[PDB]
Structure 1
Amino acid sequence: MNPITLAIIYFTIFLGPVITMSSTNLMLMWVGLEFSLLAIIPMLINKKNPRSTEAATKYFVTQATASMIILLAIVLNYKQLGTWMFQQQTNGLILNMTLMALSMKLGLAPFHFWLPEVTQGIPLHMGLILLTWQKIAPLSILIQIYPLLNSTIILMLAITSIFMGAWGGLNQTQMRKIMAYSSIAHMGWMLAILPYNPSLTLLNLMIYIILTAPMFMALMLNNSMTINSISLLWNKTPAMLTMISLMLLSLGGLPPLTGFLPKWIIITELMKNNCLIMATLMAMMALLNLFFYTRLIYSTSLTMFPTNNNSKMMTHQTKTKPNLMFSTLAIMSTMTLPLAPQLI
């Protein structure tokens, strides 16, 4: 990429979420969403492999129709209130549209089909951006409008996502898609507490970002899109085997690690609000997510899969190092739990 183009695109992919967050005029929030859609598509097809064009053409159609639905909500509001922004008075259907639409861009629940497929055809790098710096934008729009959205729908999309994400993940063996599925699940918890305590959504996101960003830079350190590929981690780079183990169990909710806090406080907030029906079912299938996380643990760490002689060759050569971010984001993530009170 002519480095100039790289700058323009990257600026847009970054001006995209930032305009959304900063503005209050919904319109300006919509174009922030629009710029993110335009900026991400070029990077998605960088290899320009036949799989890639498929990825982008899906991502784009799914993103575009949702963008149009979000605009329709703003256009309708403009007639029901002269304001260009959702208010207490807003017709309920107007808000529900925004939930569905925004739940498509974020890819939650019954609209979770595009994400796993686009996460499969894009590079590991652009995978991260597509999973974590593109969720900030839509979530911002929701978090702003939380007082007004429906508790019922969110919960249904929340629970569905948790289930779909979990069930989908169990079968998958491609890593990119295992992560895509996890993201659907975590995204679910996040949207469950939005109606009740938005501030916790912003924790269940950061922690997801501080967990997923190290996890993916791990997958690419050896650029392994297969579990079999990550399983030979012990030969290619032995040290990351320890933290890859804890980060994945952290992604699932197991108690000593940082990953428990988001689930724990979301459950505490939902019980405070009396959803002890919903919270219980979510926590239970949340346990399904750890099963596929630990199955990967087995292959990568607890058991040593057989490797190839040609690997000895890759050992010889100095391994290009993992950026510092890996460490700082691996530790702050695997073990901050002793510092939970301040985090919340």
Structure 2
Amino acid sequence: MNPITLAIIYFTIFLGPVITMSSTNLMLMWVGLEFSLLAIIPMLINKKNPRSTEAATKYFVTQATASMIILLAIVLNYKQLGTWMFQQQTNGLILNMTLMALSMKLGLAPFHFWLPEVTQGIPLHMGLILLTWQKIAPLSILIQIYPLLNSTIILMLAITSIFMGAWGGLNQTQMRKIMAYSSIAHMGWMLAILPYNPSLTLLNLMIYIILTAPMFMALMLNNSMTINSISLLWNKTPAMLTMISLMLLSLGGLPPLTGFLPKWIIITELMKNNCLIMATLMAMMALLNLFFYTRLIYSTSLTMFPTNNNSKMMTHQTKTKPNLMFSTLAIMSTMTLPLAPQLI
């Protein structure tokens, strides 16, 4: 891949969500989504192996069906009201079809089965984008219509997502599938709080992004796509444990760490709205995410696993990978609770 191709594809990847967020016309939003899809597929398939091809095929089919359903919703609203924007008068079925489509675009349960497979078949720098930058346009389209949504189906989707994310991460031994299920869970939290306050959806979005980017960078440091491969980190690069552990605990949502605040304030709002039963279920089932993050903190930072020999030569060699953003984002994501009133 040459510079011109790289520039065009990445400019499209960047432009998609920007059009989606800067356009008032649902047609232009749909355009942005299509841009994102078109420009993401090639990067997934770069390696040209069976797994990457399969992941690309699955992604394409799912996202294309979703886009078609969204465009049907738009066309129906157009026949109904003459305008190209959802108002307070659209048949709720239109908006529920739209929500189903956006949920399949994001990766929410029970529309999630494609996300772990794709992320696994895909490399690291691509999972990073797929799980951080490709959540911003479909969430924006929802933030624009939060007053006219169905709390019932939203909460069902969110709680299903929490549950399935926990019960997947409990079993997966692969970094990328673990990240996929964590994404599912946090997006469930977002959807849950959406129709009551979207500022908190955006808060949790930025928190999850700041928490995910540096984790994928940590992994890419040694291309450790597995638990038994990341356990050798104590001999390969032990100056990263003090931060991997803290970022994983923050993801889990442990009180003294940034990652807590999202759950805390979202539960607060749900209580103000009398969604206490759902808030309780979610808060109790996030502890499994915390569990299978602690199980990794163990194998990485609190106990040394059987190492290898050529790791000696790996020690001999130097390295210049981890740019400043790693430290910056990890600190901002682990030590920023005293500033919660501002982030709110």
TM-score range, shorter chain: over 0.9
Could you report, residue by residue, the CA deviation over 1:131-181 in whole angstroms, capped at 9, with x for unpaired residues?
Answer: 110001100001111011110111000000000101011000000110011
How far apart are 1:320 and its partner, in Å? 2.5
Q: 195-204 or 320-329: which moved more? A: 320-329
Please give the alpha-carbon distance, in whole angstroms, between the structure 1 residues aligned to 2:121 and 2:132. 17
CA RMSD of aligned residues (A): 0.6
Please give the alpha-carbon distance, in whole angstroms, between the structure 2 residues aligned to 1:328 and 1:84. 42
How far apart are 1:231 and its partner, in Å? 0.7
Please give the alpha-carbon distance, in whole angstroms, between the structure 2 residues aligned to 1:124 and 1:284. 30
Could you report, residue by residue, the CA deviation over 1:202-223 in whole angstroms, capped at 9, with x for unpaired residues?
Answer: 0010000000001110111111
Could you report, residue by residue, the CA deviation over 1:51-95 in whole angstroms, capped at 9, with x for unpaired residues?
Answer: 100000000001100010010000100011111011001110000
Could you report, residue by residue, the CA deviation over 1:171-199 in whole angstroms, capped at 9, with x for unpaired residues?
Answer: 00000110011000111001101000011
Could you report, residue by residue, the CA deviation over 1:9-68 in whole angstroms, capped at 9, with x for unpaired residues?
Answer: 000010011100010111111111111010100000111111100000000001100010
Please give the alpha-carbon distance, in whole angstroms, between the structure 1 residues aligned to 2:323 and 2:115. 27
Please give the alpha-carbon distance, in whole angstroms, between the structure 1 residues aligned to 2:98 and 2:303. 47
Could you report, residue by residue, the CA deviation over 1:85-127 in whole angstroms, capped at 9, with x for unpaired residues?
Answer: 1100111000001100000000101011111111101110011
How far apart are 1:323 and its partner, in Å? 1.2
How far apart are 1:275 and its partner, in Å? 0.1
Q: 180-189 or 317-326: which moved more? A: 317-326
Please give the alpha-carbon distance, in whole angstroms, between the structure 2 residues aligned to 1:9 and 1:51. 22
How far apart are 1:306 and its partner, in Å? 1.1
Please give the alpha-carbon distance, in whole angstroms, between the structure 2 residues aligned to 1:227 and 1:334. 23
Residues 1-344 of structure 1 aligned to structure 2 (within 5 Å): 1-344=1-344
Secondary structure, in 3 states, of the residue corresponding to 2:89?
Answer: coil
Percentage of pairs with the same residue: 100
TM-score by length of 2: 0.99
TM-score by length of 1: 0.99
Give structure 1 regions of 4+ aligned residues with deviation exceeding 4 angstroms. none
Please give the alpha-carbon distance, in whole angstroms, between the structure 1 residues aligned to 2:218 and 2:97. 38
Could you report, residue by residue, the CA deviation over 1:265-317 in whole angstroms, capped at 9, with x for unpaired residues?
Answer: 11001101110011100110011110000001110111111110110111110
Secondary structure, in 3 states, of the residue corresponding to 1:338?
Answer: coil
Please give the alpha-carbon distance, in whole angstroms, between the structure 1 residues aligned to 2:230 and 2:143. 36
How far apart are 1:321 and its partner, in Å? 2.7
Please give the alpha-carbon distance, in whole angstroms, between the structure 1 residues aligned to 2:187 and 2:54. 24
Secondary structure, in 3 states, of the residue corresponding to 2:143?
Answer: helix
Please give the alpha-carbon distance, in whole angstroms, between the structure 1 residues aligned to 2:294 and 2:130. 25
Please give the alpha-carbon distance, in whole angstroms, between the structure 2 residues aligned to 1:187 and 1:227. 24
How far apart are 1:319 and its partner, in Å? 1.8
Q: Which runs of 5+ in 2 are unaligned?
A: none
How far apart are 1:2 and its partner, in Å? 1.4
How far apart are 1:335 and its partner, in Å? 1.0
Q: Which runs of 5+ in 1 are unaligned?
A: none
Matched residues, number:
344
Please give the alpha-carbon distance, in whole angstroms, between the structure 2 residues aligned to 1:246 and 1:125. 22
Please give the alpha-carbon distance, in whole angstroms, between the structure 1 residues aligned to 2:68 and 2:217. 34
Secondary structure, in 3 states, of the residue corresponding to 1:83?
Answer: coil
Please give the alpha-carbon distance, in whole angstroms, between the structure 2 residues aligned to 1:135 and 1:291. 26
Please give the alpha-carbon distance, in whole angstroms, between the structure 2 residues aligned to 1:66 and 1:321. 38
